[PDB]
C-alpha cells in the first residue's frame, strides 16, 4: 500500500517493511519507483534508454505527451520493435487517431507544432496538446474554426459572436476557413440564410432588416424560413427568404 509523503508516492507494500523499488502493478495500473530514491516517477522519465510518461500520481498512461525534444508517442506493447507499454516508439510520417483526436508525426517521430502543411492541406495542431485543433481558436490575431485540425467553412459561433469563416481569396487573400470582414449584407450558405452587421457578426433573435421582420436561430444564427415556426409559445409563418407574414 502506497502513501504520499511530502507530495511523493512511496510504495510501502504491507508488512511495514519500509520500502521497495522498480516497476510495480498496483491495482491494474503500473508504476515505476526510482531505484535509488524509491519515489514514484512523475512526468517525462527516462529508464534504461527507453522513454516513459507518468501523470502527477505516478500512474503510467499511454498517449502523445511532451518530451524535451517534443511530443512523443508512448505506445502499446507490440507496435514497434517489441516495445513495452508506455514506451516511446518510432512513428514516421503517419497520422494517429487517439481518443478521437488526431496527431501527425514528422520525420523524427515527433508530433506537429501549430501550423503544418500535410500533402496539400493545411492542418493546425494545438501547440498545447499537439492534437489537431477542434473548435474556435485564434492564431496571430486571425480567427478560425477547426474540426479535426482543418479550418472549416461556414457561419459558426465564436468568442465575439457568430463569424463567417469564408474560403480562401474571398476577403483580402484570406486563408481558407479564416474569418473575414462581412458588413451589412446577407449570406446564403448551405440553404440557410444569415445577416451580418457592421461588426461582421451574424445577428440572432428578432431583427428588422429593411422594413421587414426576420428571426434568426439563437444557436446557429440561421434565418427561419420555409414554413411554420413556434418561436416560444407563438406560431409564425416565415417566407422562403425569411420574411414573416
Amino acid at each position, epitope marked *: 500500500g502506497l502513501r504520499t509523503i511530502d507530495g511523493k508516492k512511496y510504495y510501502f507494500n504491507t508488512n511495514t517493511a519500509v520500502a521497495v523499488t522498480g516497476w510495480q502493478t498496483i491495482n491494474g495500473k503500473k508504476y515505476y519507483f526510482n531505484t535509488n530514491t524509491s519515489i514514484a516517477s512523475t512526468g517525462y522519465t527516462i529508464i534504461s534508454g527507453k522513454h516513459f510518461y507518468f501523470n502527477t500520481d505516478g500512474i503510467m498512461q499511454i498517449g502523445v505527451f511532451k518530451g524535451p525534444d517534443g511530443f512523443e508517442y508512448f505506445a502499446p506493447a507490440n507496435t514497434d520493435a517489441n516495445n513495452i507499454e508506455g514506451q516511446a516508439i518510432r512513428y514516421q510520417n503517419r497520422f494517429l487517431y487517439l481518443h478521437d483526436n488526431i496527431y501527425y508525426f514528422g520525420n523524427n517521430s515527433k508530433a506537429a507544432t501549430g501550423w503544418v502543411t500535410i500533402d496539400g492541406n493545411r492542418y493546425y495542431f494545438e501547440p498545447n496538446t499537439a492534437m489537431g485543433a477542434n473548435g474556435y481558436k485564434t492564431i496571430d490575431n486571425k480567427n478560425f474554426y477547426f474540426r479535426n485540425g482543418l479550418p472549416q467553412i461556414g457561419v459558426f459561433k465564436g468568442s465575439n459572436g457568430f463569424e463567417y469563416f469564408a474560403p480562401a*481569396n*474571398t*476577403d483580402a487573400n484570406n486563408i481558407e476557413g479564416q474569418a473575414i470582414r*462581412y*458588413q451589412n*449584407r446577407f449570406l446564403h450558405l448551405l440553404g440557410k440564410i444569415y445577416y451580418f452587421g457592421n461588426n461582421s457578426k451574424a445577428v440572432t433573435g428578432w431583427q428588422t432588416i429593411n422594413g421587414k421582420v426576420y428571426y434568426f436561430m439563437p444557436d446557429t444564427a440561421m434565418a427561419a424560413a420555409g414554413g411554420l415556426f413556434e418561436i416560444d409559445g407563438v406560431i409564425y409563418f416565415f417566407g422562403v427568404d425569411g420574411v414573416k407574414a
Partner: antibody
Amino acid sequence: VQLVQSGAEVKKPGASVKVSCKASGYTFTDYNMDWVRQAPGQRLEWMGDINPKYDIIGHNPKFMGRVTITRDTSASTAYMELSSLRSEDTAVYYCARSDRGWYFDVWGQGTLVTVSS
Amino acid sequence: IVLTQSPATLSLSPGERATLSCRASSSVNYMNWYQQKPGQAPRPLIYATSNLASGIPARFSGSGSGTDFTLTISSLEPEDFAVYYCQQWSSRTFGGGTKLE
C-alpha cells in the same frame, strides 16, 4: 480575359430579366462573380456575388426578395435574375471578378435594363 | 457604414494637379478607386490602397488611413476625363464619385 454579358432587354414592370455573364480566358471556378447596379446619373450599388462553392451570397437588403443568382460551371457562365421588377430599378448591371478578394479584376460590357409601360 | 468624398464635380484643364478624397464614417483598413468613361463600363485603378494594376500610369498615387482616403494624379491628360468612384471592399459599398470636365 474578358467577361461578356447578354444583350439589352426592356420589359414591363412586374416581370423578370435573367442576365448572363460568359467568362473567357480563365478558369471560372478560381474567382467569384459580382453584380452592381448603376442607375442613370446615380451611384454604384452592389447586388451579390456567387462563389464556386454554390453559395449565392450578399443580397443587398433592398434586393433580398427580388434577386436570384445562379451558376452554370458546365458552360462556364454566370447568371443573375430580378423578380417583382419596378420602374425604379432601370439601370445597367455589370459583372466583375475578385482578385484574391480584391477590387474586381475585369468588368462586363454592362447590360441595358430599362422598365416602363 | 457610409463614406463621403470632397469634390463631386470638377472642371480642370490638361496639365493641372488633381486631388480627390473619400472619407469613411468608420475606421476602415483598405480602399479602392474606379474610373469610368461615359458609355463604357467602370475601370479599376487602385486596390488595397497604395497599389495599382490593369495598366495605369505611375502618376496615380493612392493614399489614405483610417477615415480619410485620398487619390493623387500628378498630371492630367485629355483622354483621362472620366468619373472616379471609390469603394469599400468589406462592406461592399461605393461612393458618389467625382466627374471631370
